[PDB]
Design a protein around this nucleic acid. Structure first.
Lengths: 14, 39, 144, 120, 143, 139, 72, 189
RNA sequence: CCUACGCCGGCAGGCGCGGGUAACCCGUUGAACCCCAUUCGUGAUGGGGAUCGGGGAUUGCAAUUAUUCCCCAUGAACGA
């Protein structure tokens, strides 16, 4: 459920 | 008067403890001089 | 032999001066009497339901012990030991507004007088009253 | 959605002076201090980029450095790239973040996920 | 003292077993959401002497304590003894107790997870939040 | 008609002003029971209980206390009262009874009339204070 | 384990506190507290009541150490 | 005249052991009103043999870490302990103190003699001053470790341990360790 | 910039008003423990306050990764 905006960086914080 | 005398005595004692009186006086004089210079 | 307030046990004098201010009954009492500590450097509430009265008594007596002490000096007398958590304790001062308005409330009873000298001292009414109650507790001392 | 008993239409129709009681200690502190010209210009670029978008469409993302920007509720609905040293992280400003900073939304380092000790 | 004959050996105030024999000014602290200072400033307006215990009370005292305790503004517990000052929803100066306490902690954590903020992912991961120096700590409870 | 002496521990100074009086002992306007480290009252009562109050018959004794801590001030007041009575009987009464009361005080305790030879000393560089120094590590 | 001493009086507790106490050679709130499962607050208030009973001498009285003594 | 704490008598006090008779100074001109002397006694060697006994029980009682300047708590603990012994016995409690110090110090002691690795001890005689100091340290230690977690005030604990060792109980930690060193004395020889 | 004094702040702080370019004015540098009374009463408890959730006020261009201080609530480990 990764946002369409943000990068992989904050997604690795998810 | 008596009270005053007592106070004086106490002061003297304190001075002695610190020490000496002469030295203190000298210091005071120096301070005064410094102040004057500043002025 | 005009008796001296300084020639009495001071904390029995504080308890009797608290009872004397209780029997008086006339004073402008504030509204944060049931809320606050003395300052930041304590933890819990005071147990006394009349803590304002006995603090006013002790504050009048500390005014008796020296004239020339303002609210900041009254803040500074009632200091103590703040425990800073696991960081070590320090000296922390009293509360400004509370001691200021204690001096203001006793100023209402003409027992605290503002001077030319900036601070507040005891009235001649105040020293008359303290020497009367001093004779009361002095008879409570040398005759009990 | 409601914030502090005030609604989104109620906030967005509220003046700039009356915001300054509805915030946190630091936020009312900074709004007392008054915003800078750089952040004024960034909000102006946000006005231009939120206006010219098609009405079905979300506005074009504006990227920025200024991590110490208060998220004003007027910014809600935009998409902002926030710079955390390397990478503009693109956050859709939802109305739940009107009392925070941008700088917490682009998390600056990578989480430590340990290995094993060699020669210690 | 005396031997108070209505002595409930178990108290049940707001979903909490209270050891009723404990001191009244220290048995209210036992529930979540009420500490030591707060129950005292309750009791100074709840008009009960501190000399008594917690099992020596009347239920009329109990119902006026819970009345003041859920109505903290109307009985002069003003807006700094409160557990929550300005909520996210209503901003209402209001005390929050045990079940609602865990509920609103959970609410704020779910919010900051939904916000995708720097705090929320820490709180989902269960780590330190206030920027601590963990170059020697992080020992007990990590695996 | 008056004698003016003192007593000195570490920082505590006790100024004594005595003369022909009534048996009056003021310590800045308070008795010798009104000093809150009160168990040491007995040490504070050692000039009276050793010598008898009949020897403190007609003497005004004013005490004004400076500096120090409470225990140091108590031993300073004890010091100053004993030296004040001894100096009074030396200057105004015989040598013999002064010598006798000196022998009563010293053979009980010399610290009553003589000073203490030591103080919280100054510091030579290299540690917290004078004697103990800082700590290090190996390996 | 639990030293949850009795916070208030009882029947037999007072039947020993009014009775057994003036026969101890030493009446201490810790001792009276310790022998009969009583908190030092409860025994402390009870020993001030035994001042008000007049049975028992009061020898020492301090902050936290108040010594009572059985009579004769 | 001179009485301890305003009331307590010293002329009734009698020493039993001649071997310890001078190294406790209580009887005639070492009786003072308080244990708080505040003079030097560790000036040079054996000058803490002519300091008063109750001063030694005082100054060896601030031993632990958090109490390490608070002598006034110690002198009120001494006062309450003497009053408790005077209740539970009736006699002059200084006699109980002297009989407790005499009955508690060791008589033979073990000392490691050899090299660092030859633990082949040799039970030797106890010096009288070290017998005094070992007795005072055992009495203070029994007052400490039996008053760590209790309802009893440490004055009560000191007083009861001083009573139990003055009569030579199997209850005193001091008498237990005296018997232990005396039994180790049987073993090394 | 060290502050006294007064006023307004339940607490951090504001506002007015001097001295002090300095043994002077802060300064008598009015401290802490200590003490005397109160409460607690040997258990994770009111010890320990960490770990956090709400706020509030200063420092500053800038406090979000908590600057610092304050006010509730949270109360883990720790039994020498």
């Amino acid at each position: 459920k990764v946002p369409k905006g943000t990068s992989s960086y904050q997604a690795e914080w998810i | 008067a008596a009270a005053a005398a007592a106070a004086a005595a106490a002061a003297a004692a304190a001075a002695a403890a610190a020490a000496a009186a002469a030295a203190a006086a000298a210091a005071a004089a120096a301070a005064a001089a410094a102040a004057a210079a500043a002025a | 032999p005009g008796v001296t307030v300084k020639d009495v046990n001071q904390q029995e004098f504080v308890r009797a001066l608290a009872a004397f201010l209780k029997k008086s009954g006339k004073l402008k009492v504030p509204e944060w009497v049931d809320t606050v500590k003395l300052a930041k450097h304590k933890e819990l509430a005071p147990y006394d339901e009349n803590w304002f009265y006995t603090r006013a008594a002790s504050t009048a007596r500390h005014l008796y012990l020296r004239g020339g002490a303002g609210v900041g000096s009254m803040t500074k007398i009632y200091g103590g030991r703040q425990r800073n958590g696991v960081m070590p304790s320090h000296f922390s001062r009293g509360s400004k507004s509370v001691a200021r308005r204690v001096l203001q409330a006793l100023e209402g009873l003409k027992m605290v007088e503002k001077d030319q000298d900036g601070g507040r001292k005891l009235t001649p009414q105040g020293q008359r009253d303290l020497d009367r109650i001093a004779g009361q507790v002095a008879a409570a001392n040398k005759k009990h | 959605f409601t914030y502090r008993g005030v609604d989104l239409d109620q906030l967005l129709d509220m003046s700039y002076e009356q915001l300054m009681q509805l915030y946190s200690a630091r936020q009312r502190r900074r709004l007392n201090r008054g915003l800078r010209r750089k952040q004024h210009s960034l909000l102006k670029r946000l006005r231009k980029a939120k206006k010219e978008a098609p009405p079905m469409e979300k506005p074009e993302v504006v990227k920025t450095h200024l991590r110490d920007m208060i998220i004003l509720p007027e910014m809600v609905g935009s998409m902002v790239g926030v710079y955390n040293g390397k990478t503009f992280n693109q956050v859709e400003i939802k109305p739940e973040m009107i009392g925070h900073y941008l700088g917490e939304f682009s998390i600056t380092y990578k989480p430590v996920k340990h290995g094993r000790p060699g020669i210690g | 003292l005396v031997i108070p004959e209505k002595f409930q050996h178990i108290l049940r105030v707001l979903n909490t077993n209270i050891d009723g024999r404990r001191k009244i000014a220290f048995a209210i602290t036992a529930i979540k959401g009420v500490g030591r200072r707060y129950a005292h400033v309750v009791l100074r307006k709840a008009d009960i002497d501190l000399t008594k215990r917690a099992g020596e009370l009347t239920e009329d005292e109990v119902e006026r304590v819970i009345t003041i305790m859920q109505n903290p503004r109307q009985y002069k517990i003003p807006d700094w003894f409160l557990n929550r000052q300005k909520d996210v929803k209503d901003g209402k100066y209001s005390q929050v107790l045990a079940n609602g306490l865990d509920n609103k902690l959970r609410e704020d954590l779910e919010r900051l997870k939904k916000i995708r903020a720097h705090r929320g992912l820490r709180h989902f991961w269960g780590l330190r939040v206030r920027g601590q120096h963990t170059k020697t700590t992080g020992r007990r409870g990590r695996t | 008609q008056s004698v003016q002496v003192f007593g000195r521990k570490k920082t505590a100074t006790a100024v004594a002003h005595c003369k022909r009086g009534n048996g009056l002992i003021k310590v800045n306007g308070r008795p010798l029971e009104m000093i809150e480290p009160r168990t040491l009252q007995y040490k504070l009562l050692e000039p009276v209980l050793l010598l008898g109050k009949e020897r403190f018959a007609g003497v005004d004794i004013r005490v004004r206390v400076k500096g120090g801590g409470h225990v140091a001030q108590i031993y300073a007041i004890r010091q100053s009262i004993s030296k004040a009575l001894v100096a009074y009987y030396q200057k105004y009464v015989d040598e013999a009874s002064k010598k006798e009361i000196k022998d009563i005080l010293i053979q009980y305790d010399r610290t009553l009339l003589v000073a203490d030879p030591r103080r919280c000393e100054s510091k030579k560089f290299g540690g917290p204070g004078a004697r103990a120094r800082y700590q290090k590590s190996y390996r | 384990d639990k030293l949850n001493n009795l916070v208030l009086f009882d029947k037999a507790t007072y039947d020993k506190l009014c009775k057994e106490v003036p026969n101890y050679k030493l009446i201490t709130p810790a001792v009276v507290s310790e022998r009969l499962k009583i908190r030092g607050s409860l025994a402390r208030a009870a020993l001030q009541e035994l001042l008000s009973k007049g049975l028992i001498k009061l020898v020492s009285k301090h902050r936290a150490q108040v010594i009572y003594t059985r009579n004769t | 005249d001179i009485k301890l704490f305003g009331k307590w008598s010293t002329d009734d006090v009698q020493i039993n052991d001649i071997s310890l008779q001078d190294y406790i100074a209580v009887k005639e001109k070492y009786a003072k009103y308080l244990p708080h002397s505040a003079g030097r006694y560790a000036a040079k060697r054996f000058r803490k043999a002519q300091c008063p006994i109750v001063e030694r029980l005082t100054n060896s009682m601030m031993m632990h870490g958090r109490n390490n300047g608070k002598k006034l708590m110690t002198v009120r603990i001494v006062k309450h302990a003497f009053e408790i012994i005077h209740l539970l016995t009736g006699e002059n409690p200084l006699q109980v103190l002297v009989n407790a110090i005499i009955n508690s110090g060791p008589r033979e002691d073990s000392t490691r003699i050899g090299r660092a690795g030859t633990v082949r001890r040799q039970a030797v005689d106890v010096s009288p001053l070290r017998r005094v100091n070992q007795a005072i340290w055992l009495l203070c230690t029994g007052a400490r470790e039996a008053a760590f977690r209790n309802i009893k005030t440490i004055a009560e604990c000191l007083a009861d341990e001083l009573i139990n060792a003055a009569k030579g109980s199997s209850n005193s930690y001091a008498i237990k360790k005296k018997d232990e060193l005396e039994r180790v004395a049987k073993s090394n020889r």
